[PDB]
Amino acid sequence: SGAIYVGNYRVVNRHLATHNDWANLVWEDSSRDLLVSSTTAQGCDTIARCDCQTGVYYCSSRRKHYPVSFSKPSLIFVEASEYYPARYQSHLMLAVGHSEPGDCGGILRCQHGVVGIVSTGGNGLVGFADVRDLLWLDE
Ligand SMILES: NC(=O)[C@H]1CCCN(C(=O)Nc2cc3c(cc2Cl)OCO3)C1
Ligand SMILES: [Zn+2]
C-alpha cells in the first residue's frame, strides 16, 4: 500500500483504490494502473519534472529504502492477476530490486521529488508507474 498526496489530489495504484477514491474520482487509467482522487486536505509532496534514471524507493516487505537505476517510461508486458488480464502496462519503469504485491504504492524519489509508485514485481525486478508527465497534478 501507499499513496502520493499533492495539492487536492491522492494518487494510488488503480488496483488498490478504495470506494472513497472511486466516489471522488478525478482520473483513472487501467493501462497505467493509476487512479487519482480528490481530497479535502492539502497534500505537500513535490512531484519531479525530469528525465532522471536513478532514485530511491520504499520497499515495505523489507522495511527498507533501496537506491536503484530504473528504465525510461515504456510499454512493458505484465502477467495476469486477480486485478488484470495479461497486458502491456504503459508508462512503466523497471529496476533490479525486491518487490512483493504488498509493496505496490511505495514511492520512488529522485533529488527533484516524487517519480512514481511501485506497481509490479517478481523475478528480482520492481516496476514503477511513472507520474512525472501528469503536469496537472500541480494545478
Ligand atoms: N500493475 C499490475 O498489473 C500489478 C497488479 C498487482 C499484481 N502485480 C504484480 O506484479 N504482482 C507481483 C507478483 C509477484 C511478485 C511481486 C509482485 Cl508485485 O513476486 C512474486 O510474484 C501486477
Ligand atoms: Zn529527477
- Cβ < 5 A residues, ion ligand 2: 48, 50, 52, 110, 112
Query: Which run of H or of E encompasses 13?
Result: strand 4-13
The 3 state secondary structure assigned to 56-80 is EEEEHHHCEEEEEEECCCEEEEECC
Residue linked to cell 529496476: 95
Pairing of strands 125-130, 113-120: antiparallel
**Distance in angstroms (rounded) separating the CA atoms of residues 134 and 65:** 25
- Residue 41, C-alpha cell as written in the block: 486536505
The CA-CA-CA angle for residues 20, 131, 89, to 5°, reads 85
**Distance in angstroms (rounded) separating the CA atoms of residues 20 and 91:** 25
Specify whether 130 is catalytic.
Answer: no
Given a contact cutoff of 8 angstroms between Cβ atoms, the answer to whether 91 and 73 are in contact is yes
- Residue 2, C-alpha cell as written in the block: 501507499
- 114 C-alpha to ligand 2 centroid (Å): 8
- Residue 131, C-alpha cell as written in the block: 507520474
Resolution for this PDB entry, in angstroms? 1.7
CA 92 to chain centre: 9
Is 91 marked as binding a ligand?
Answer: no
With 0-12 / 13-18 / 19 or more C-beta atoms within 10 angstroms meaning exposed / middle / buried, residue 128 is buried
Give all strands of the β-sheet with 87-96 in edge-to-edge order: 64-69, 54-59, 107-110, 113-120, 125-130, 87-96, 74-78
